[PDB]
Amino acid sequence: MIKQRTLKNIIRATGVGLHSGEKVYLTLKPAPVDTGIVFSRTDLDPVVEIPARAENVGETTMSTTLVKGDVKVDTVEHLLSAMAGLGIDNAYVELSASEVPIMDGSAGPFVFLIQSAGLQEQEAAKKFIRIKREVSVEEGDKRAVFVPFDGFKVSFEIDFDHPVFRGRTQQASVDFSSTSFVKEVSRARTFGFMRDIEYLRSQNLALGGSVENAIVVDENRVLNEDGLRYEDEFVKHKILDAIGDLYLLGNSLIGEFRGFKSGHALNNQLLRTLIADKDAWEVVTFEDARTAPISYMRP
Ligand SMILES: C[C@H](O)c1nccn1CCCc1ccc(Cl)cc1
Ligand SMILES: [Cl-]
Ligand SMILES: [Zn+2]
């Protein structure tokens, strides 16, 4: 059967919050079967646990943010994408600060962290959410939708009105795999625009943002001196952001996702609509690896 996976070992990392600007200590730990991904705030007495699930999402305004009354864990999306990307079902994440470290602004460093620690198979069946019929959410000009598909396919369409794009709209479509995710989606960086610089920092946002952890874009061009890791990097990161946000569903998706000028707010808006719509999904497990559609890196 296709089994659940967890970390073989403990790993530690250290970095800075993009929005907060604080130093943060991050620890990753193996966890028991059916635990899912739990986020732990170790700088509080007692320790506070916010599970990584769609129903705990609070603020979605410029990042995906989990809420347990007083306490928050912020900017979870990139880390949760690496974890979905390598098929990590169960892990404890400990943070010493309110926000997850931005690192290089991509899922690459977390992928490096998970591969070095290693994957551990567990003696329990891996469960998936299968999309049985279409679900959609619209917020004026923006849109997002789950459709039935035999595997995992993420598609994105972005219609910026910035000179950097030459009047055109950006599109990329990915057929998800563990191999395709790491070379194809995982190195795609976070981006800011010069023209949000007043607005951004008035509300205490991107306090830790720099050319070292994001694409900084001036009106004329991309200021980062070696340019872009991918020609289509902006849109591959919007795909990195979704994959991460959808994994708060608690389980791998057999289905297709399509985004049209969508973001964290709508992505979370879509999950909740799907959970409510019980007729549009079911949970499934696989007796045989050959019968299962979606392919993961082997430990
Ligand atoms: C944080 C979120 O994951 C995300 N992905 C792409 C853009 N964003 C929003 C980041 C906002 C941001 C604003 C300014 C700067 Cl310098 C850097 C980042
Ligand atoms: Cl807090
Ligand atoms: Zn992002």
Measured by CA distance, the residue closest to atom 13 of ligand 1 is: 192
Q: Which of 18, 228, 240 to mutate to test the pocket of ligand 1 (most atoms within 8 A of CB)?
A: 18
206 C-beta closer than 6 A to ligand 1: yes
Residue numbers in the known binding site for Zn(2+) are 78, 237, 241
Report the nearest-CA residue for atom 1 of ligand 1. 63
Specify whether the CB–CB gap between 82 and 107 falls below 8 A.
Answer: yes
Residue 3 CA to residue 51 CA, distance in Å, equals 21
Annotated binding site: 78, 237, 241
Q: Which residues in 2-70 belong to E strands, given as ranges?
A: 3-7, 11-16, 23-30, 37-41, 48-51, 66-68
* Cβ(245)–Cβ(265) below 8 Å: no
Measuring from atom 6 of ligand 1, which residue has the nearest CA? 190
CA 252 to each of CA 70, 171, 201, 293: distance values in angstroms, whole numbers, following the listed order: 30, 24, 36, 12
The answer to whether residues 254 and 129 touch, using CB atoms and an 8 Å cutoff, is: yes
CA 102–ligand 2 middle distance (angstroms): 17
Of 84, 65, 107, the C-alpha closest to 268 is 65
| Structure determined via | X-ray
Q: Is the bond leading into 46 cis (omega within 30 degrees of zero)? A: yes
* CB contact at 8 A, 283 and 128: yes
Ligand having the closest approach to the CA of 241:
3
Output the CA 48–ligand 2 centroid distance in Å: 11
Residue 143: which H helix or E strand, with range?
strand 142-147
The span from the CA of 264 to the CA of 137, in Å, is 13
Domain boundaries, the chain: 1-127, 128-299
List the beta bridge partners of residue 126: none
Instruction: Characterize the bridge pairing of strands 11-16 and 191-193.
Output: unpaired
Q: How far is ligand 2, taken at its centre, from the CA of residue 105, in Å?
A: 22
Dist. CA 103 → ligand 2 center (Å): 20
Q: Where are the alpha helices (DSSP H) in the chain?
A: 77-86, 108-117, 178-184, 197-202, 233-246, 264-276
Where residue 76 falls (left for φ over 0; alpha for ψ -120 to 50; beta otherwise) is alpha
For the annotated catalytic residues, the residue numbers are 264
- Residue 235 to residues 36, 114, 269: CA-CA distances in angstroms? 28, 24, 20
Q: Is there an atom of ligand 1 within 6 Å of 63 CB?
A: yes
127, β-bridge pairs? none
